[PDB]
Amino acid sequence: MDTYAGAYDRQSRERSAASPATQRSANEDKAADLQREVERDGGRFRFVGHFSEAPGAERPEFERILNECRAGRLNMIIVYDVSRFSRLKVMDAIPIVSELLALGVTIVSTQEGVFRQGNVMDLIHLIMRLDASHKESSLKSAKILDTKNLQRELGGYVGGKAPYGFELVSETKEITRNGRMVNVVINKLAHSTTPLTGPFEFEPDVIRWWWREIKTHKPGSITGLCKRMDADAVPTRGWDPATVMRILRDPRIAGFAAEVIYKKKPDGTPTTKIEGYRIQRDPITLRPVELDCGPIIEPAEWYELQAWLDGRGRGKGLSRGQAILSAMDKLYCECGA
Amino acid sequence: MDTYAGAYDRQSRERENSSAASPATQRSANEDKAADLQREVERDGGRFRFVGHFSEAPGERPEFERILNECRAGRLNMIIVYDVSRFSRLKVMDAIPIVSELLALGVTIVSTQEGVFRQGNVMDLIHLIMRLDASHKESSLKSLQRELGGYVGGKAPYGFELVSETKEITRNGRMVNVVINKLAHSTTPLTGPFEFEPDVIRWWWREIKTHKGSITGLCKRMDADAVPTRGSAWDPATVMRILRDPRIAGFAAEVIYKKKPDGTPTTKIEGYRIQRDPITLRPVELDCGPIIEPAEWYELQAWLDGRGRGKGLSRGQAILSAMDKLYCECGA
């Protein structure tokens, strides 16, 4: 009952996916969770660290971690997603995951779950769903792409001004489109570093403060926060309760990519007023897509915050069970809409 | 350069591949192929030995396991089969893992009907098997059972009983009646201090729930208070397996069993997959309704996770953990 685990990370070949840094962070958090469970259950668990391929043997770190598994020194590999095992197309991961599982290795995908020899066919069927997806993304990507669609394709922020808490930072992508090497400048969201006037340094600090005031109080009202902000000279992007709540509803503060939903006129033409947000999700797992800049408020805290706002909106706080059930209900509506 | 080759043959199961190919036909093609390969390897300076036929008795698969184990030990490095479908257990797709393992060991697979496969062209084999899978799936549609929202299984799970119901079906303009079993809350009168099995389940939550109490404690109390096991002591693992059951929250679910290395399922429950609407992802509700209300059930799952991790979850962590379980279910 001894688990020896390594993690493997590498950049995507472009053709969704996170940075090595994002992968390593999820991988080590997963390792810490697994360790607690195994130890609770009497066993032993050792995380030996990250096998990280250099951005550029084509895959010497991958070969190293696989050889440790073949020699029986590791019996678990953690990856951000099962696609990391692939070389050119996701389908070509099938032989190597089959070999690993037949050796008794457990594969843990942070995004997709746990796979062992017992459930190897679950992994095979997963990889094929990923293949069928991706093939569908390819067809869309093969089309003629306008400015916004190209920006979306490259992980770029479509929009005028960065939302509160954030700033826009430019980045140049080297793309090959129809056999032509082309450079495209995109904007990515970063945590705002604009120096503010009053008692908080940057916009993220103001946001974290709002949650600190609300959580710990049983200020601690949103109107109260606004009156305190005006008195303490917290600058207003040059305070309305509706604006504060609109920001607290923004999934991007939790590090989740999201579409802003605007209020539409009877005509159907959108106004400039924000109605709400739709979290951007992986098409197979439904897991939220993560912004490269990471969270302003950790996801766990953000979900607690949303439950708090819902309890205020309903005029009654939710039990822990009702909070879980309500979060599920919001997801089922996002899906049905 | 040395080749050690065995051949493997077995009758078709009723599954879809060359059935006309009797074992005798397979063996004859297999040994003719071996003779051809031998000539070629020897022309080319190498050495080749055919060790004979591994032939499964017309009926789990001891000769198959034998030839695989000889490959794993390095005593054979080639398997000759009439067709790649021989490697499969139930569906042709399930041949993928075993051929992948064999090729990663340096084995050459020679299919008399389909060609030669090694590690260097493993994807050719994978793509072939999938084309065969896609083809049987299309053959299946063309042409049985009552898997249409009826409980498929022997005994009702703890908390429940089986009640029969008639579904009125019209299939291609023909009226057919199909008798199914549906899950109902158990009404079997119990011995001890609780009336029915649902009462015992609700009691567990009452004893455990953290408002501001252990599973081993519940089991010791149950034995003392004479709470009957279905029918011989209460096992903590069993209590938790039941508390994990989404059906007790009124949600339809598939039971996931622990599989042998082979892939063949055991009778041991590994977990559950909530059945969901394909568009909204909302759980499909059992007609009989919840034993424990959904809100309480989700709280219970967070409580079990906190016990499993050895540390209680914050409210946020509980929400995030429940989401994480859903994201894994969705991909399956």
Residues 114-133 (B) with a CB less than 8 A from some CB of A: 119, 122-123, 126, 130
Beta strands (DSSP E) in B12-137 are 47-55, 78-81, 108-111, 115-117
CA B289 to chain centre: 27
From CA A314, how far away is CA B253, in angstroms rounded? 31
Give the single-character DSSP code of A288.
Answer: B
- Give the nearest chain B residue to A326 (CA atoms): B295
Q: In B143-247, which ranges are continuous DSSP H helix?
A: 197-208, 215-224, 236-243
Question: Which residues of chain A are within 8 Å of residue B280 when distances are taken between CB atoms?
Answer: 332-333, 335-336
Two structure tokens written together for B144: 């049985």
A20: amino acid identity, one letter: P
Among residues A223, A209, A220, the alpha carbon closest in space to that of A253 is found at A209
- Cβ B295–A324 below 8 Å, yes or no? yes
The number of beta carbons lying within 10 Å of the beta carbon of residue B313 is 19
Cα–Cα dist A76/A78, whole Å: 7
Return d(Cα B181, Cα B148) in angstroms, integer.
Answer: 11
DSSP state of B179: E
Interface membership of A21 toward B (CB under 8 Å): no
Strand segments (E) across chain A: 2-9, 44-52, 76-79, 106-109, 113-115, 166-177, 180-191, 258-264, 270-279
Please tell me what resolution, in angstroms, this structure has. Answer: 2.2
Interface contact B94-A121, CB threshold 8 A: yes
Q: B-chain residues within 8 Å CB-CB of A101?
A: 97
Q: Which residues of A282-298 are buried (b: 16+ CB within 10 A; e: fewer)?
A: bebbbbbbbbbeebbbb
- Exposed / middle / buried, residue B24 (Cβ in 10 Å: 0-12, 13-18, 19+): exposed
- Residues B233 and A173: their CA atoms lie apart, in Å, by 65
Contact A207, A225 (CB under 8 A): no
From the list B106, B104, B79, B84, the residue with the least C-alpha distance to B95 is B84
Relative to beta strand B265-274, strand B253-259 is antiparallel
Q: How many CA atoms lie within 13 A of A166 on its CB side?
A: 27
Min distance B37 CA to chain A CA atoms (Å): 26
CB of B95 closer than 8 Å to CB of B87? yes
Structure tokens at B58: 């017309």
Starting at the edge strand found earlier in the chain, the sheet holding A76-79 runs A44-52, A2-9, A76-79, A106-109, A113-115
CB contact under 8 A, A95 and B258: no
DSSP conformational letter for A297: S
Cβ(A154)–Cβ(A145) below 8 Å = no
Q: Least CB-CB distance to B308: which of A37, A96, A286?
A: A37
For every residue of B235-298, DSSP letters joined together read -HHHHHHHHT-GGGGTB-EEEEEEEPTTS-EEEEEEEEEE-B-TTT-PBPBPTT--SS-HHHHH
Q: In Å, how far is B327's CA from the nearest CA of chain A?
A: 5
Taking each continuous run of H as one helix and of E as one strand, the counts in chain A are: 10, 9
Phi/psi of residue B63, each to 5°? -75, -35
Helix (H) or strand (E) holding B2: strand B2-9
Chains A and B form CB pairs within 8 A to the count of 150
C-alpha angle B125-B129-B133 in degrees, rounded to nearest 5: 170
Does an H or E element contain B167, and which?
A: strand B160-171
Instruction: Please tell me if residue A29 touches chain B, with a CB cutoff of 8 Å.
Output: no
Burial label, A200 (beta-carbon count in 10 A; 0-12, 13-18, 19+): middle
β-bridge mates for residue B164, sequence order: B181
The closest CB to that of A303, out of B263, B310, B319, belongs to B319
Q: How many CA atoms lie within 13 A of A20 on its CB side?
A: 12
State whether A36 and B282 contact (CB < 8 Å).
Answer: no
Long-range interactions of B152-159: CB distance < 8 A, separation 24+: B153/B255, B156/B183, B156/B186, B157/B183, B157/B242, B157/B245, B157/B247, B157/B255, B158/B197, B158/B201, B158/B230, B158/B242, B159/B185, B159/B186, B159/B197, B159/B198, B159/B200, B159/B201, B159/B242, B159/B245, B159/B247, B159/B248, B159/B291
| A198 contacts: CB under 8 Å, gap ≥ 6 | A232, A233, A234, A235
Q: Do A118 and B261 touch (CB under 8 A)?
A: yes
Q: Give the rounded distance of the alpha carbon of A132 from its chain centre.
A: 22
Q: What's the Cα-to-Cα distance from A98 to each of A20, A102, A105, B65, rounded to whole Å?
A: 24, 6, 10, 17
Eight-state DSSP code of residue A197: S
For residue B311, the chain A residues in CB contact (below 8 A) are 36
Strands B47-55 and B108-111 turn out to be unpaired
Residues 285-304 of A with CB under 8 A from B: 285-287, 298-304
Q: Which residue of B has its CA nearest to A102?
A: B101
Write the CA distances from B3 to B49, B71, B83, integer angstroms: 6, 12, 20
Contacts of A39 in chain B (CB under 8 A): 310
The alpha-carbon gap from B140 to the nearest alpha carbon of chain A, in Å, equals 19
> What pairs with residue B172 in β-bridges?
none
Q: Which two tokens stand for residue B180?
A: 């199914």
Residue given tokens 């800049």 in the structure block? A293
Interchain pair A300, B322: CB under 8 A: no
User: Which H helix or E strand runs over B8?
Assistant: strand B2-9
CB contact under 8 A, B319 and A332: no
Residues of chain A found within 8 Å of residue B294, distances taken between Cβ atoms: 321, 325
Beta bridge partners of B78: B5, B108
Q: Is A256 on the interface with B (CB under 8 A)?
A: no
Question: Is A5:A31 a contact under the CB 8 Å cutoff?
Answer: yes
**What are the structure tokens assigned to B320, written together?**
């995030």
Give residue for tokens 């679910």: B253
Least CA distance to A333: which residue of chain B? B280
Q: How far from the centroid of its chain's Cα atoms is residue B271's Cα?
A: 11
Asked if residues B329 and B274 have their Cβ atoms less than 8 Å apart, the reply is yes
From CA B52, how far away is CA B70, in angstroms rounded? 13
Q: Please report, as a single letter, which amino acid is at residue A153.
A: E
Burial class of residue A218, CB neighbours in 10 A (0-12, 13-18, 19+): exposed
CB neighbour list of residue B266: distance below 8 Å, 6 or more residues apart? B257, B258, B259, B260
CB atoms within 10 A of CB A246: 18
B274 contacts in chain A (CB < 8 Å): none
Beta carbons of A4 and A73 less than 8 angstroms apart: yes
Residue A224's H or E segment, with its range, is helix A222-231
Burial class (CB in 10 A: 0-12, 13-18, 19+), B44: exposed
Q: What is the largest CA-CA distance in chain B?
A: 84
Q: Which of A38, A328, A329, A331 to mutate to test the interface with B (most CBs of B within 10 A)?
A: A328
- Best residue in B304, B315, B329 to probe A by mutation, most A CBs within 10 Å? B315
DSSP string, A8-71: EE----------HHHHHHHHHHHHHHHHHHHHHTT-EEEEEEEEE------SHHHHHHHHHHHT
Q: Does B213 touch chain A (CB under 8 A)?
A: no
Contact: A299, B311; criterion CB under 8 Å: no
End-to-end CA, chain B: 44
Enumerate helices (H) and strands (E) in chain B, giving the number of each: 9, 9
List chain B gaps (C–N > 2.5 A) by preceding residue. 59, 143, 212, 231
B142 contacts chain A (CB < 8 A): no
The residues, ordered by sequence, that sit 6+ positions from B223 with a Cβ below 8 Å of its Cβ are B233, B234
d(CA A51, CA A27): 11
Give φ, ψ of B3 to 5 degrees: -110, 130
DSSP assigned state of A146: -
* B282 close contact with A: CB closer than 8 A: yes
Give the type of residue at B214.
S
Listed in sequence order, the residues at least 6 apart from B251 whose beta carbon sits closer than 8 Å to its beta carbon are B274, B275, B283, B284, B285, B286, B294
Domains, chain A, with CATH or none? 1-140 (3.40.50.1390), 141-337 (3.90.1750.20)
- If you search the block for the tokens 């939790």, which residue do you land on? A254
First CA to last CA distance, chain A: 46
The CA distance from B318 to B299, in Å, is 8
Segment holding B7, helix H or strand E: strand B2-9
Instruction: Kindly state whether A72 is in contact with chain B, defined as any CB-CB distance less than 8 angstroms.
Output: no
The residue assigned the tokens 């706002």 is: A309
- The C-alpha atoms of residue B312 and residue B320 are separated, in whole angstroms, by 13
Q: Cβ A321–B297 below 8 Å, yes or no?
A: yes
Q: What is the DSSP letter of B28?
A: H
Among the listed residues A196, A206, A286, A218, the one whose alpha carbon sits nearest the alpha carbon of residue A253: A206
CA distances for B222 relative to A271, A281, B209, B248, B303, angstroms: 63, 45, 17, 19, 20
Three-state secondary-structure class, residue B56: coil
Contact A304 B314 (CB under 8 A): yes
Write the CB contacts of B33 (distance below 8 Å, at least 6 apart in sequence): B80, B110, B112
CB A28 within 8 A of CB A47: yes
Of the candidates B189, B144, B211, B133, the residue with the CA atom closest to the CA atom of residue B171: B144
Question: Would you give the distance in Å from CA A320 to the centre of its chain?
Answer: 24
Picking from A81, A114, A131, A324 by the largest number of B CB atoms within 10 A of its own CB, the best residue to mutate is A324
Q: Do A285 and B331 touch (CB under 8 A)?
A: yes
Q: How far apart are CA A196 and CA A25, in angstroms?
A: 30
A319-B312-A111 Cα angle (round to 5)? 90
Q: Which method was used?
A: X-ray
> DSSP letters of B282-296?
PBPBPTT--SS-HHH
Alpha-helix runs per DSSP H in A143-175: 147-153
Q: What are φ and ψ of residue B10, in 5° steps?
A: -165, 155
